[PDB]
Swiss-Prot record:
Binding site for substrate: 7, 11-14, 71, 220
Pfam families: FGGY_C
The organism's taxonomic lineage, starting at the top: Bacteria, Bacillati, Cyanobacteriota, Cyanophyceae, Synechococcales
Cofactors that this protein relies on: a divalent metal cation
Protein name according to UniProt: D-ribulose kinase
Family per record: Belongs to the FGGY kinase family.
Amino acid sequence: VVALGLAFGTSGARAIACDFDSDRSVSVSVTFPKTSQNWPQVWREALWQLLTQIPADWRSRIERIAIDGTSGTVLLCDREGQPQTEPLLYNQACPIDLADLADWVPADHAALSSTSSLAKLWFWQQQFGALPPDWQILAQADWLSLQLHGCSQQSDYHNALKLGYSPDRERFSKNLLDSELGALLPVVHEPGVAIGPILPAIAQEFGLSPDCQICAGTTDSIAAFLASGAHQPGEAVTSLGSTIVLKLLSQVAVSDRLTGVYSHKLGGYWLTGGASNCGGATLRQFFPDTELESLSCQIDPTKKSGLDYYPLPSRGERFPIADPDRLPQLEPRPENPVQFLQGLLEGLTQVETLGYQRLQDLGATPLKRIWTAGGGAKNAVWQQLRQQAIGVPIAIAPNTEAAFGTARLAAFGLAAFHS
């Protein structure tokens, strides 16, 4: 099977078509402008540009397509899918009373956030008088795949979570469905299942097979986890980026109020995780990237530095332990910048260690091994510190592109995530 993944991120989009029988692939990209008066136009146009860059011989062989988009970027559209107002982006918060959402979702549901899709929908309900029942709210991924299969009000249970979906009971609440917002909600499917064939006109225009199937999508974060290929409870992916992001596959759903930990359904399993404010940004505050290698190769991880840093880039921590007034702790300073860097790496290591331990203590499946992504993944000193602290196998993730994760989704769905 040849499959196509399309991944829409915060600053651009990437398409990867993969032939999984020959292990062959092609990857194309588009970069978003940093300003627009019509972002939906930008995204749709990007979709066509991506398709157009894929070689015609690849296009004629693609039989499944899936799309991931940024979590919490949503559009308010009419019955035809035409946006009726500017999108509300993933990072935009709405000034609403979360109490107004209390009867529509469980106690500490993840949708109870000023930046959630549900909050944005209610916000639109405040700004408009009453929202016409024939309208619809669509996540970025939803809207984009709609461009390919034509079926309105269709989403997946990843994107839908922040809209108020409860994947533990595979439903929206009866209270939400019967409310004024109910008519605008999508029908929610499992990521990777076929929603419908490609639109005939789109197939002919782009030289795709008219029997090509468009699948339910996912989020960009989740697609990045799918890229790793990990599918056994206890397997995790650490993203050593500007911030440290942990994702852990678990037999059981876990969550935590103060730290905002929650879980996505992933087949018969659950994907939990957390994001610290600590990360590579802290390192960049003291060392140019060229200097980090020069110094790293001078560190012997087998001997302790004696330093006990908490490597925040600024005030406040959210995970593993929430403290809005948590201070960066970078004292004392050694004379040697090698030793200072070692202390920083030890602190970041402690953040990862404590993170997975916390997740386990919340009930997640005990860590079995770690796949590493991001800028810090190729740092072997840091990897050694992490192995020593955590005591499970750690390696660089084979693949880290959201588009490749989404290609795998298109091709195999979530079948691997069952016993």
